[PDB]
Design a protein around this ligand. Structure first.
Ligand code: ADP
Ligand code: ADP
Ligand code: MG
Ligand code: MG
Ligand code: ZN
Ligand code: ZN
Ligand code: ZN
Lengths: 635, 272, 387
DNA sequence: AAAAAAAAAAAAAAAAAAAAATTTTTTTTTTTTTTTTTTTTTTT
DNA sequence: AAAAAAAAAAAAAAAAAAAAAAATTTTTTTTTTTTTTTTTTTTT
């Protein structure tokens, strides 16, 4: 006689009151105003703030946090009442409730079994994301021994058939045909995340667990992000996970076996309905946010800007000496190496990719190489770029086999499709890849990144799946000279051992010679020792890391023109550069250096967020290249 | 007309079946042209001149002249497509009654469906609906022969179990032989069967349309009987078809969420 | 979609026209008035006169006679629309039409296969009546394989399942369930009549056959009642009791049998569906009547008899010396034994049965015995009372 | 001459016997592919 | 002569083909036993 879950229904009542009576500081019912928007299609969840829950009613908040799994469909039906009473939605549509701003936090090591079935939030790095699918939630079946339809059987993260046919005189437990049209599904994406690098124990592999994303919180996560998740920890049934027998269910009916049909062996197990109970933790993400959000939300991003950050980046753009200021903020630790500071900053801003009418994809990224004597802050610059920017992947030399370097393949464990696992270039897409010990990359993969640099794209066809993955990343390379030490009496192409096309593709080359000059030596010693003595202070990044990072994200979408005067200056200055080439530089000048100079001029216009590249930018870009290219010093 | 019942059940009722079949016949004969030409006459003329087996009609013209059908089309596309097959068969037989030997069938394709979804966003809310989409063919198997009206030898007595229509959903299975009355080990009569061309392609979202941090997603697609080899790998193609779930694809197997694959019975492929 | 029995359709139209046109001598439509009387429950039958039908139209009568069984369901449907188009009655009530006053008659021995289907009019005494029953007329079935429902599969005086399950991809001819609630029924009684004495040819045993009665005629005939069944001869399927192999009905599809299932033996017979075609002749009566019309409670008889017969009975009742008059009427050929004539007459008129407060039977009827020397007309007295 | 015992024939009912009957799923096997080690071969 | 780079080998893992493995009572027929009825043959 339809026994009622008293606490869950009281939670439905109190939460319906919360929805229809909690009002913002302005005084209006904020969640009424939010429920207004679920009338639209492609929208079936409200996003209720857990802090609002706490403020309105602490008792209900603790009850939900301690009984989240049992109350969840009840809260969903409370929302269904709250929206159907006002607006005239389709009756069949389902709804969901998404929590965020939860006070407590936990770790993937803390997600122990006691946290099963109750709300919890974690942080993670989204490894990979399987495709969207429709998942069956409530099935309608037909019993193939009396053709009676069994209605609305729940799926507990497994294809569940009705436990017995609803007709009393028919004990069908086997032959059921799913009536697909009558059943209702939920949109569903499975994603894999792993422990953040901060939370690793000693000698520990990063654990990884699978997180299920039900409707409307489905494509929000993406591979490579740093996302906080909030939701239940559930258990999804597993089978044949172990070769040792474990916990097994079976009916408690005391039946025996008659002679010739004795309930032994396979017949016996099928008769009793024996089944192993092997489970696995599978987080059930109710909501997903970036763990380090960029904003509290060019014209669209500008609208997303809050007023304070908007005026901040505005006065940033209006600032003069922003050039050296950005240098200092990016590299407070570094002393000297101003050319590397400038080149790497321009690399972060990037150029403007373009494409011809015929279809030739003109490069827009600008790859930089640092080559020098040992212990000259090369790996340090790459680490600075890594730790600074998002979409800043890092790898070093022979630590990355090609498959993980660019792309790999796996089959969808659920469906027939294949998931194209994202390699370093992909995770660095539309960003930076910092490659260290670039000279010590095998030919088999240095050619791969060369293909990426030529085409901004790699097409993988392997193990039964073909695809054309885009990778518009920019490469910052570190290259040790041959012999360990650079030799200024030799050309660059014989100091290092890169392939000639790779060296051609590389946009900027910086030479860092470890000469022994004692004023500089005093400077460096004072600098680093000052840092170690005064770790926390002794940094004067005039703009905070978040400030300049937001400035980069906002500046990126401005695409400079090239005015006619600047074009005249460009051509005449490249002519002067060729006159220099015509003594000799350690790496000769070609039309690729013209391409490099125009791309750097574009990137300086990008730094100042202009819509026109001016002779100021052109002059500075030429100066950068001219000082980068050095005269080989024969005695 | 409209009532409380769903659109699919409505169009399944015989009364509105005759209603909308009459409407399709009506505008096939009468929707003359933008500028008074009776374009359907010339289109059918060329169609039977080549024996194309497949007509195509513009959704803008469809909806503008008669909008009830256009509204019904994405809701329950399969039924509307079957009826329009029958109605187009009627009109082509009216124009050329000699066509009877020619394939006994005409397909109909719908072009310029206004609402294009993107392969990133094809959710539960599009199942059993005719959508329009774009992509690039990553793979395209060869043309295979499919059963369309299959006859079976009852290999107990060699009676020719009559021609069963073969829907795309589940493989046809005869119950028993009308002669010897056995659900015997029936087996297909290779000759009296009239097969149908079947080709399987896989489209994916183009990198020019994929977003910043992403992997392009790929949807399958089935071409049948006239559209096979209408597109090669690497072709940028628009695809219009019934996004579809209920064939036999489902992860009812062990170790799996109750999660369904999907396909697209392609109803029109357009290279670009 | 379908194809009709065109002659049956036009005959139904003309027959409805007959029902709604044919005025009696008064002018009002007697069959319309009887149809009005047909409103009640336990009134699902209209008896019709071939003479009225013939006076309405000749060729209508000729075709009705010559192919009565062809058109007969269509005639019943004609009656049903005729009443329903102007009356209110349960929509599943089936109104049958029987016939009367056919001018010609046939002997029992004149039953011949040329007479099958076409209307007749026989006359033979009743031997025994069987109980009333509900017969199945057309049932709905459920195929036990695909659970498909088949509507109104007509029976042919045998429990016939449909020829095949209505699902095209289903070959069921072997496993059906009658939805007994949705099936429809009709009152039914079979009475076994035999050839009378007069029609018997020399040397022969009488010809006895099992006439059928349907609807309101389910009880009009009783034991001994020499009746006149105006029905139609009909062959029913027969028994598996015939030793001589005769008239196999088999399949035309020429289907053979593969190795292991060679179509030779009982397997082959069932596979081809070869069956016997034996038959017997049964009569399907629709309106029974007495052979000689009996006079065309005391008030019941007074109402049943006509005015001339009534006044004749009345005046002779009043007439004097009716003792002697009836004696000479009932024994005009015998002479003498006048007192015996008197006594047998008084026994014929009988007494009154009486029941007591105790309920013991007290006999009213008289019993008479005649003894005498041989050839004194004893058997003649008995034969006189017999006839 | 009437009664009755026996005979053959016909029928009902209970016990035993007769007959009808492919489809779905799982597992071995083969065959390739990929990783990583080992080996061999070219260079300074 | 020894180091670096490349090629081949060895071994583990995965995907499809095709041969094996498993499940699996109920309804109809019909012979035999028993009783019953009409008749003929025999006895009182
Ligand atoms: N100009 C400099 N300014 C600051 N630190 C420096 C400078 N040159 C060298 N260093 C120090 O040297 C250390 C190692 O430099 P690194 O770039 O890792 O060497 P390599 O280039 O060989 O990897 C850094 O941690 C850094 O503190
Ligand atoms: N007293 C009589 N009056 C008239 N007819 C008589 C008389 N006695 C005998 N008969 C005639 O005798 C004939 C045969 O008589 P029957 O019926 O054989 O008598 P029973 O059967 O008693 O021997 C009849 O035709 C009958 O008319
Ligand atoms: Mg280093
Ligand atoms: Mg006598
Ligand atoms: Zn059941
Ligand atoms: Zn057969
Ligand atoms: Zn059936």
């Amino acid at each position: 006689l339809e026994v009622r879950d008293e606490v869950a229904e009281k939670c439905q009542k109190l939460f319906l009151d919360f929805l229809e009576e909690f009002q913002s500081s302005d005084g209006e019912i904020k969640y009424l105003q939010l429920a207004e928007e679920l009338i639209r299609p492609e929208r079936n969840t409200l996003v209720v703030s857990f802090v609002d829950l706490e403020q309105f009613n602490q008792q209900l908040s603790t009850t939900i946090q301690e009984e989240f799994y049992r109350v969840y469909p009840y809260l969903c039906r409370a929302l269904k009442t709250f929206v159907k009473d006002r607006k005239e939605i389709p009756l069949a549509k389902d709804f969901y409730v998404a929590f965020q701003d939860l006070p407590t936090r936990h770790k993937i090591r803390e997600l122990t079994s006691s946290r099963i079935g109750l709300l919890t939030r974690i942080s993670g790095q989204v490894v990979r994301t399987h495709p969207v699918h429709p998942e069956l939630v409530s099935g309608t079946f037909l019993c193939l021994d009396c053709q009676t339809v069994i209605r609305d059987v729940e799926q507990q993260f497994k294809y569940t058939q009705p436990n017995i046919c609803r007709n009393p005189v028919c004990a069908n437990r086997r032959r059921f045909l799913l009536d697909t049209n009558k059943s209702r599904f939920v949109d569903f994406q499975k994603v894999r995340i792993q422990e953040t690098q901060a939370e690793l124990p000693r000698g520990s592999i990063p654990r990884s667990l699978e997180v299920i994303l039900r409707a409307e919180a489905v494509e929000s996560a993406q591979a490579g992000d740093k996302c906080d998740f909030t939701g239940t920890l559930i258990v999804v049934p597993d089978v044949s996970k172990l070769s040792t027998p474990g916990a097994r269910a079976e009916t408690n009916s005391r039946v025996s076996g008659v002679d010739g049909y004795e309930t032994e062996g396979i017949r016996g197990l099928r008769a009793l309905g024996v089944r192993d109970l092997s489970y696995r933790l599978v987080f059930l993400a109710c909501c997903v946010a970036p763990t380090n959000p960029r904003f509290g939300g060019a014209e669209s991003i500008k609208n997303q800007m809050t007023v304070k950050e908007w005026e901040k980046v505005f006065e940033m753009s209006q600032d003069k000496n922003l050039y050296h200021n950005l240098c200092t903020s990016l590299f407070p630790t570094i002393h000297g190496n101003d050319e590397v500071k400038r080149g790497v900053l321009l690399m972060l801003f990037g150029g403007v990719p373009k494409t011809t009418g015929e279809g030739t994809s003109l490069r827009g990224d600008i790859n930089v190489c640092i080559v020098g004597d040992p212990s000259t802050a090369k790996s340090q610059f790459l680490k600075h770029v890594e730790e600074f920017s998002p979409r800043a992947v890092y790898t070093s030399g022979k630590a990355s086999s090609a498959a993980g370097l660019t792309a790999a393949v796996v089959r969808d464990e659920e469906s027939h499709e294949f998931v194209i696992e994202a390699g370093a270039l992909m995770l660095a897409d539309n960003g930076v890849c910092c490659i260290d010990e670039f000279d010590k990359m095998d030919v088999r993969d240095q050619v791969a990144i060369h293909e990426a640099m030529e085409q901004q794209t790699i097409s993988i066809t392997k193990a039964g799946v073909k695809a054309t993955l885009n990778a518009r990343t920019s490469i910052l390379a570190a290259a040790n000279p041959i012999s360990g030490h650079y030799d200024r009496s030799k050309s660059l192409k014989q100091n290092i051992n890169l392939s000639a096309p790779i060296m051609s593709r590389f946009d900027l080359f910086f030479i860092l010679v470890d000469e022994c000059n004692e004023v500089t030596d005093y400077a460096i010693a004072r600098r680093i020792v000052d840092l170690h003595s005064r770790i926390e202070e002794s940094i004067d990044r005039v703009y905070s890391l978040d400030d300049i990072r937001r400035y980069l994200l906002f500046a990126r979408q401005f695409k400079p023109k090239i005015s006619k005067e600047s074009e005249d200056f460009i051509v005449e200055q490249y002519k002067h550069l060729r006159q220099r080439d015509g003594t000799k530089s350690s790496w000769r000048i070609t039309v690729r250096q013209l391409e490099s100079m125009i791309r750097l001029s574009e990137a300086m216009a990008r730094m100042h967020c202009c819509d026109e590249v001016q002779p100021k930018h052109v002059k500075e870009a030429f100066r950068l290249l001219n000082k980068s290219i050095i005269r080989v010093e024969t005695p | 007309d409209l009532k409380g019942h769903s659109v699919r059940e409505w169009v399944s009722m015989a009364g509105p079946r005759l209603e909308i079949h009459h409407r399709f016949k009506n505008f096939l004969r009468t929707h003359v042209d933008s500028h008074g030409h009776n374009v359907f006459k010339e289109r059918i003329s060329d169609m039977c001149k080549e024996n194309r087996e497949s007509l195509v009609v513009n959704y803008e013209d469809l909806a503008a002249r008669e909008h009830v059908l256009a509204y019904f089309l994405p809701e329950a596309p399969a039924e509307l497509l079957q009826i329009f097959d029958e109605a187009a068969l009627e009109v082509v037989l009216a124009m050329y009654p000699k066509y009877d030997r020619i394939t006994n069938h005409i397909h109909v394709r719908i072009s310029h469906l206004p609402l294009v979804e993107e392969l990133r966003s094809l959710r539960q809310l599009h199942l059993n609906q005719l959508i329009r989409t774009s992509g690039v063919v990553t793979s395209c198997t060869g043309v295979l022969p499919q059963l369309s009206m299959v006859k079976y030898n009852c290999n107990k007595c060699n009676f020719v179990l009559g021609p069963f229509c073969q829907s795309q959903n589940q493989e046809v299975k005869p119950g028993s032989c009308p002669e010897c009355q056995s659900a015997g080990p029936f087996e297909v009569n290779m000759e009296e069967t009239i097969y149908q061309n079947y080709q399987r392609i896989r489209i994916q979202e183009s990198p020019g349309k994929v977003a910043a941090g992403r992997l392009p997603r790929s949807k399958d697609a089935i071409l049948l009987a006239d559209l096979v080899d209408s597109c090669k790998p690497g072709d940028e193609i628009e695809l219009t078809g019934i996004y579809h779930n209920n064939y036999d694809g489902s992860l009812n197997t062990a170790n799996g969420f109750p999660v369904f694959a999907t396909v697209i019975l392609a109803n029109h492929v357009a290279k670009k | 979609l379908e194809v009709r029995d065109e002659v049956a359709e036009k005959c139904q139209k003309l027959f409805l026209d007959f029902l709604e046109e044919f005025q009696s001598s008064d002018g009002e439509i007697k069959y319309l008035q009887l149809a009005e009387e047909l409103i009640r429950p336990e009134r699902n039958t209209l008896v019709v006169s071939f003479v009225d039908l013939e006076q309405f139209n000749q060729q209508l009568s000729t075709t009705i006679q010559e192919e009565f069984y062809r058109v007969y369901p269509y005639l019943c449907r004609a009656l049903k629309t005729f009443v329903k188009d102007r009356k209110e009655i349960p929509l599943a009530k089936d109104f049958y039409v029987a016939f009367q006053d056919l001018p010609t008659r046939h002997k029992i021995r004149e039953l011949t296969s040329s007479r099958i289907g076409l209307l007749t009019r026989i006359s033979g005494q009743v031997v025994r009546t069987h109980p009333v029953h509900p017969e199945l007329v057309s049932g709905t079935f459920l195929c036990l394989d695909c659970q498909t429902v088949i509507r109104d599969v007509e029976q042919q005086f045998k429990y016939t399942q449909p020829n095949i399950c209505r699902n095209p991809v289903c070959a069921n001819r072997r496993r059906f369930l009658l939805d007994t609630n949705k099936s429809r029924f009709v009152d039914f009684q079979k009475v076994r009549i035999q050839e009378t004495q007069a029609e018997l040819p020399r040397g022969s045993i009488p010809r006895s056959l099992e006439v059928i009665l349907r609807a309101e005629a389910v009880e009009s005939a009783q034991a001994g009642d020499k009746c006149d069944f105006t029905g139609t001869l009909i062959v029913v399927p027969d028994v598996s009791k015939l030793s001589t192999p005769g008239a196999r009905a088999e399949t035309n599809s020429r289907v053979s049998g593969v190795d292991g299932y060679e179509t030779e033996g009982i397997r082959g017979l069932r596979a081809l569906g070869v069956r016997d075609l034996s038959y017997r002749l049964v009569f399907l009566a629709c309106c029974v009547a007495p052979t000689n019309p009996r006079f065309g409670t005391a008030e019941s008889i007074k109402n049943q008899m006509t005015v001339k017969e009534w006044e004749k009975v009345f005046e002779m009742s009043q007439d004097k010396n009716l003792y002697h008059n009836l004696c000479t009427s009932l024994f005009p050929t015998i002479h003498g034994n006048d007192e015996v004539k008197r006594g047998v007459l008084l026994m014929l008129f009988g007494g009154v049965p009486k029941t007591t407060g105790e309920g013991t039977s007290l006999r009213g009827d008289i019993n008479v015995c005649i003894v005498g020397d041989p050839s004194t007309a004893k058997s003649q007295f008995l034969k006189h009372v017999e006839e």
